[PDB]
Each structure stands twice: as structure tokens, then as C-alpha cells.
Amino acid sequence: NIPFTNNLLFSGQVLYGDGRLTAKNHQLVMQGDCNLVLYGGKYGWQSNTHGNGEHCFLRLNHKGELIIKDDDFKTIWSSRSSSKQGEYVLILQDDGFGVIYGPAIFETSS
Amino acid sequence: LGTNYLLSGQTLDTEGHLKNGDFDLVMQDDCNLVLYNGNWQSNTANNGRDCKLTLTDYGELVIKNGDGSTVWKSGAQSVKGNYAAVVHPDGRLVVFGPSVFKIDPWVRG
Description:
The complex is a heterodimer of chains A (about 110) and B (about 110).
Chain A (H helix, E strand, L loop, with lengths): L7 E3 L3 E3 L2 E4 L4 E4 L5 E4 L5 E2 L10 E4 L5 E4 L5 E4 L10 E4 L5 E4 L2 E4 L3
Antiparallel strand pairs in A: 1-10, 2-7, 3-4, 4-5, 5-6, 7-8, 8-9, 10-11
Chain B lengths: L4 E3 L3 E2 L4 E4 L2 E5 L5 E4 L3 E2 L10 E4 L5 E4 L5 E4 L10 E5 L3 E5 L2 E5 L6
Antiparallel strand pairs in B: 1-10, 2-7, 3-4, 4-5, 5-6, 7-8, 8-9, 10-11
Protein name (chain A): Mannose-specific lectin 1 chain 2
């Protein structure tokens, strides 16, 4: 398991049950009601999946696809952004954007 | 100063830091880019003054001195797009990209 950082979600990491990413003026919450909601900014954003399932969780994979699953692994919502195999990160940025970056192309060590 | 990440187009100015937990990336007065507690440095001490860290549209970390002359490059590059350098909590500086997906709270959904 990878340690959590407040504004980051790396491949393999999971958010559920009102777990959230936090930035300066923004929050991205995988809510108890199965809606993924970015609070803040002009319009905000939502997966628009309220009540679509039970005990939903958010997971970023190692191809850069962000997925909401319910308790039985029924796909609720997908970012539909599959790309080349590797390490990915979702950053809730201080400017409000939630951006998936990857794969890794440089590192200081293993 | 700021956060735990540098995006392409942003500058980490002289003595500016990026922090995640005990790991602190500092663009030093002596032009060395150093990841405190991370056993990494660019190794460019006394190679310039007023040095600055940038990240290119191809995901390369670049250090430049006061004049704008390139002191150091990370030497790993990918396609054109948006990139992010992150102080990973395991104490690595990692460049990720290009961007694959964006959640945007600033435009009509």
C-alpha cells in the first residue's frame, strides 16, 4: 500500500465512503451516495452517479483510467482515458482542475 | 514556494520549495536542485546564480540561471502535452505525463 497525500491519488490507491482529495480551494469526494463530486470553482463537477450503487469506491489503474465501482465491482463511472501501461497520478490542483498524468517518464530513484 | 508538484509552464524560483512530508525539493541559492531527505540533487552547485526550475511541454526538468541560460536538464522526454513533477511521499521526485484526462469545474458540464 502507498501512503496517502491529500491532493494526490496514485495508481492502485482507493478512495471510498466520503474519502476525498483536498486542495487550496477545492475538494474531490467519493461520496457515500456513489457520486464523485469536485466542490469549488465556477460550476463544480460531478460524475452524476448519485444513488447508482452501494459502497462505491474510486480507483485509478496503471493505464491512467479512473473508475468508480460499487461493492460488487459493477462499473459505475469511468474516465475512459486508458493509455500506456505505467505509474499514474491524479492531482487535485490548487487551480481546481483534477488532472490525470502519466505514465512516469523520469524519477530520482526506484 | 507552494505545494508538492510543479506543472509544465510553472516556475520553481530561487530558494522555492516543493514539499511532501519530510521530503523537500529546494532550488537553492547555489544553483543546486536538492531533494532533502531524498538522496538526490541535480549536482549543479555553483553553476549559476538566481537559478530557476521549469518543466517543458515534453516533460523535461530544466534548470536555468539568472540570464536564462540552461544549466541542467533531466534528459528524459516524451510527446508534447501537459506534465507534472511530483514529490512522491516515498521520497522520489517523479515526472508524469502527458495528461490523459481532466476534470474541469470551470466550464459548463
